[PDB]
């Protein structure tokens, strides 16, 4: 299948070169897989979700996304128009408040929750968790991410936006998960993107069009935006039978576009998420 005049990030991910506008992907589109979006919540009633999204847990008074970031990221994972894995099932876990902040203990609790909750969901092709968040180094947060990963969920986490080495940021510095840097539409490292030896891969993160609260859309920038691209790609490849939750990150890096990015400091991988689609 192809999606014509797709958002650039979607086209980038099924192209070996920058500048294309069609997103080519396999029709299976992630069906059978499940992606937990651990964020500010998701506006499940947004038409772009086609009813494939639902709220599963909140740590606040409401399960509603009064922020928009979460709806934005869920959309890149699997909305019809803006998503990588157009037929995936989305589960929202609200660990962030409507201002976009949350405590480390509630974000740890949300990760533990997914590890358990996945056991009562029917996700024949596998389970992914997408974490477009992070903060200063915490060995406890790193540790919750590693547990989630080992429980059998593909964990994709943001590198973070400080144009710094991701080693001082958590969950980003947990080696066992998949740390995602951001790039822009010219194949440059996003100016705000963290880097370092701990990154596993890059995805589109600058001016990403996706769903927003109130049934609208909006383009924002951030490595937070790159994360769902890789989470969606993982879900897509798992339903294709290419990889598993445990090896999905390494598989994405193995099949990435190599050496295409510019402004990558020595020590950081030069790998861009790539779906390898062939009609």
């Amino acid at each position: 299948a192809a999606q014509t005049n797709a958002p650039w990030g979607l086209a980038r991910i099924s192209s070996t070169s920058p500048g294309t506008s069609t997103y080519y992907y396999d029709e299976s589109a992630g069906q059978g897989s499940c992606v937990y979006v651990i964020d500010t919540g998701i506006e499940a009633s947004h038409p772009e979700f086609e009813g494939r999204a639902q709220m599963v847990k909140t740590y606040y008074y409401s399960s509603r996304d009064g922020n928009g970031h979460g709806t934005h990221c869920a959309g890149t994972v699997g909305s019809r128009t803006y998503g990588v894995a157009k037929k995936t099932q989305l589960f929202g876990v609200k660990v962030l408040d409507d201002n976009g902040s949350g405590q480390y203990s509630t974000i740890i609790a949300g990760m533990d929750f997914v590890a358990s909750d996945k056991n009562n969901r029917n996700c024949p092709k596998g389970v992914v968790a997408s974490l477009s968040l992070g903060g200063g180094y915490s060995s406890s947060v790193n540790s919750a991410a590693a547990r989630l990963q080992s429980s059998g969920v593909m964990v994709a986490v943001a590198a973070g936006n400080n144009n710094a080495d991701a080693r001082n940021y958590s969950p980003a510095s947990e080696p066992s998960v998949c740390t995602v840097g951001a790039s822009d539409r010219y194949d440059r490292r996003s100016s705000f993107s963290n880097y370092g030896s701990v990154l596993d891969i890059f995805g589109p993160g600058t001016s990403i069009l996706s769903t927003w609260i109130g049934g609208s859309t909006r383009s924002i920038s951030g490595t937070s935006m790159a994360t769902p691209h890789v989470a969606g790609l993982a879900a897509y490849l798992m339903t294709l039978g290419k990889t598993t939750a445990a090896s999905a990150c390494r598989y994405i890096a193995d099949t990435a576009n190599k050496g295409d990015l510019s402004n990558i400091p020595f020590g950081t991988v030069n790998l861009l998420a790539y779906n390898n689609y062939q009609a």
Binding site: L131, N161, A182, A226
Partner: peptide, 6 residues
Amino acid sequence: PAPFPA
């Protein structure tokens, strides 16, 4: 993370 710009 990264954000929730243009």
